């Protein structure tokens, strides 16, 4: 997250860190046994870390659970990143408490202008790099579909939404992928891709979660 702030200790209890030796992607807890993330974050071996604040120090609220089932959307396209959504079923149920909570799926798609909360342990620099130990937060508005497409000509599908600032400076970045975009307590987006990080006229592009509610519920019910 570039241009954000350090989140209040465990003020994003639904945030998860996908680990395979080290943090490589984010995700979000939607129920005691399932995590939603980005399909491009796929790996054959994944340890899900819950209740994380400072990913480099054991604080005492963490729960480390191995992923049992890893299911990428059947229509995921690695070249366009269309349908960049993935579901993970934990090997054992997560214990829900004050530091580990689930986030609600959307009842309807978010309207342009809706302010949301984006979070992650990704790069905080637009040039070079700097990875934080503490979870970073960023408040940003959903952009009109028109704006989104004009920023990324011929690259925006109906399954993508832009969230951020055309002026640049504040944005998600490498390491934030799979992370949540929450608007009014509902998961509306998943960190997917973008042109560089925090560049003007190049806001972050996110998976439009409201288009996948049916698929998510059906996949969970079937597995």
């Amino acid at each position: 997250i570039v241009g954000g702030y350090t989140c209040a200790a465990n003020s994003i209890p639904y945030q998860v860190s996908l680990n395979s030796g080290s943090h490589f992607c984010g995700g979000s807890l939607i129920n005691s046994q399932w995590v939603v993330s980005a399909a491009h974050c796929y790996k054959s071996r994944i340890q899900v870390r819950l209740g994380e604040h400072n990913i480099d120090v054991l604080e005492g609220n963490e729960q480390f659970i191995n992923a049992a089932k890893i299911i990428t959307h059947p229509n995921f396209n690695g070249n366009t990143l269309d349908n960049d959504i993935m579901l993970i079923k934990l090997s054992s149920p997560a214990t829900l408490n004050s530091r580990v909570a689930t986030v609600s799926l959307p009842r309807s798609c978010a309207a342009a202008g809706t302010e949301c909360l984006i979070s992650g342990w990704g790069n905080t620099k637009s040039s070079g790099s700097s990875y934080p130990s503490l979870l970073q937060c960023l408040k940003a508005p959903v952009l009109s579909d028109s704006s989104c497409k004009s920023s990324y000509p011929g690259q925006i599908t109906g399954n993508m939404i832009c969230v951020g600032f055309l002026e640049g400076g504040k944005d998600s970045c490498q390491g934030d992928s799979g992370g949540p975009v929450v608007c009014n307590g509902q998961l509306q987006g998943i960190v997917s891709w973008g042109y560089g990080c925090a560049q003007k006229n190049k806001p972050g592009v996110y998976t439009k979660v409201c288009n996948y509610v049916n698929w998510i519920q059906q996949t969970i019910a079937a597995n």
Binding site: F24, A38, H40, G175, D176, S192, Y195, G196
Partner: peptide, 9 residues
Amino acid sequence: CYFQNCPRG
């Protein structure tokens, strides 16, 4: 990722 489109993983 600099001056190009890339996933943010």
